């Protein structure tokens, strides 16, 4: 769902809270992938 939202945003990055929401989605993605990696690695 975070991927669908992030690809659903537009191409402009000029607006300040648009940029803020892009950065917040990117940070959530990084933490999400870190979570999945530390679950998957050990088994």
């Amino acid at each position: 769902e975070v991927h669908k939202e992030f690809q659903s945003l537009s191409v402009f990055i000029d607006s300040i809270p648009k940029k803020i929401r892009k950065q917040r989605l990117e940070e959530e993605m990084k933490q999400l992938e870190h979570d999945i990696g530390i679950i998957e690695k050990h088994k």
Binding site: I38, I39, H42, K43
Partner: peptide
């Protein structure tokens, strides 16, 4: 070889 998290 195993997992542990706080």
């Amino acid at each position: 070889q195993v997992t542990i998290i706080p």
